[PDB]
Point group: C3
Chain length 234, copies 3
């Protein structure tokens, strides 16, 4: 009965209310990333330049939406009108950098938890890509390429914003073969985006959409979990 069960699981995941737990997971991981990139002085830095620190995290937390607006010519500022989102994001940021005894940070970096957060984040990423594709389809019905790129921007735009932040923080530097970091994330966002676009135009995808959705989420979680448990071979 798998294929009837799987179909239900897919519709299940696809209907999950992301706010506020799946969103918070993404914010937490995003803040941890900004904190890791800030260095050993991260805490001193955050206490001396809170506005800058807060900004660095908000930009990364909503990177996909900023890039998306940029591509579509919508006010870059748009995302900041999701008051609930910005508030939740600022609270997480406050907790990650300033919780007493740094408990939040310590709890979030404990492997079992970081792993649970990563799963929730992948679920949320899949939703961002799908939403991005749907939004693009409503604006440019016949532009398959735009639809795909927008979907990818919503799912992997953090890379662009990171560069922007490292330039503004004066730390950007070439990345010419320092280490071998095998990341399939953005390539996976491309595939997911194409798949959702095709699905939206009912073409090569004859499979039940709720099942395809399950597979996309499944692959995201897989590749993500693989890189977390491993280091160089999956």
């Amino acid at each position: 009965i798998d294929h009837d069960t799987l179909i239900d699981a897919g519709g299940y995941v696809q209907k999950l209310k992301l706010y506020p737990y799946f969103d918070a997971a993404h914010y937490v991981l995003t803040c941890l990333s900004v904190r890791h990139d800030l260095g050993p002085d991260a805490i001193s830095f955050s206490r001396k330049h809170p506005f800058s620190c807060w900004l660095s995290c908000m930009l990364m937390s909503f990177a996909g939406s900023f890039l998306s607006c940029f591509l579509l010519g919508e006010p870059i500022i748009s995302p900041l009108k999701q008051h609930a989102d910005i508030l939740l994001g600022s609270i997480v940021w406050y907790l990650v950098f300033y919780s007493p005894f740094d408990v939040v940070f310590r709890l979030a970096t404990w492997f079992p938890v970081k792993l649970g957060l990563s799963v929730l984040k992948e679920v949320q990423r899949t939703h961002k890509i799908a939403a991005g594709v749907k939004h693009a389809v409503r604006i440019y019905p016949e532009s398959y390429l735009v639809q795909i790129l927008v979907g990818v921007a919503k799912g992997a735009g953090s890379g662009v914003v990171k560069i922007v932040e490292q330039l503004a923080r004066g730390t950007w530097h070439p990345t010419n073969h320092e280490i071998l970091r095998p990341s399939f994330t953005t390539k996976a966002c491309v595939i997911a985006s194409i798949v959702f676009t095709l699905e939206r135009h009912s073409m090569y995808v004859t499979a039940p959409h709720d099942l395809v959705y399950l597979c996309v989420v499944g692959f995201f979680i897989y590749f993500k979990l693989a890189s977390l448990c491993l280091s160089v071979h999956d």
Copy 2:
């Protein structure tokens, strides 16, 4: 009677017609900055690539307006439609880089003068922030955050444009602890912006607006004059 006098001084400064003297002060200082950043070959460089040099100065001279348009999704080109402004800016730029015997440059870098120009510039910056907040309020009445960010963009956006220019000129490089430059400008623009935003929504500011205005300008001039007379302790 101070508080009646002060109130008048505040309304006074707030009504000052910025064009063309307060504007020219800002243009002069902006051009001097681009010239200092260009190096020893600045003059040879400017004589070989005048269009590029002119562009570098216009971008910096109107940085706040370009960033503002960028954030609001308005044509980035908008600022260039202020013919009088662009003309005055181009004239100042021409004089700073090409005046015979370099008199303009020499006069502008003479401490007493550079100090007078700095005062006028701070007065103009305060007006940019306030105007930015008002503009944002008219477009997004309930978005306090957007209003603040726009105000800050109008007051401290030159930092973004500078990076853009150093990338286009091929000179950008990390700024990892070369020297200890204590600049409170942008942090002050943040405060000023918040204050004007609050003031616009008549909340925590029970003080006479014209008096608050005086304080903001006063603090800008102070922090600015402090950094000019000092080097590492104020």
Copy 3:
């Protein structure tokens, strides 16, 4: 009879249907450039990251249009709606990086051919600038400056996009006096742009427009051919 013949040649060149041969020439040269900038591992790189490689070439192939939209506040994505163009561009890109035995690449880099392609590209660049000016004139009838800048953006915007790509690829680095590369391209686009703008407002240009057009194209081809045959003195 030259001046009657020349006038005809000018109207001639100006009416040339750019698609698909003049366009393909530009795409081919653009792809060769991205390939040269990718290095010795270019081929391995392209086979491991095709989506990224394809993107790098599309961004450069339509750089002028992306910058133009950016300046005018039009959706940055707009250019991708020229399906025929994007298809032709993707096909050229596919052929340049993956043709069997690399014949396309080998044929395109054979001096006589690269020289022929360069001529066609210069013809196309002239058309981009003129189109850019006309577009700007229709939107902002009295903004001479905007009209000129837009024209220049359409003709020399690839420089901006290149920087963007080197940042995203993690290879950007200062260009502080490594070699002496004498490029007059963008300075020539500035002149061409001013000339077309003036021409559009029927001012200082009393010369037959079709003749001026011929001269502009002629100068582009000249400066371009000069740099190709030479290395340091023309």
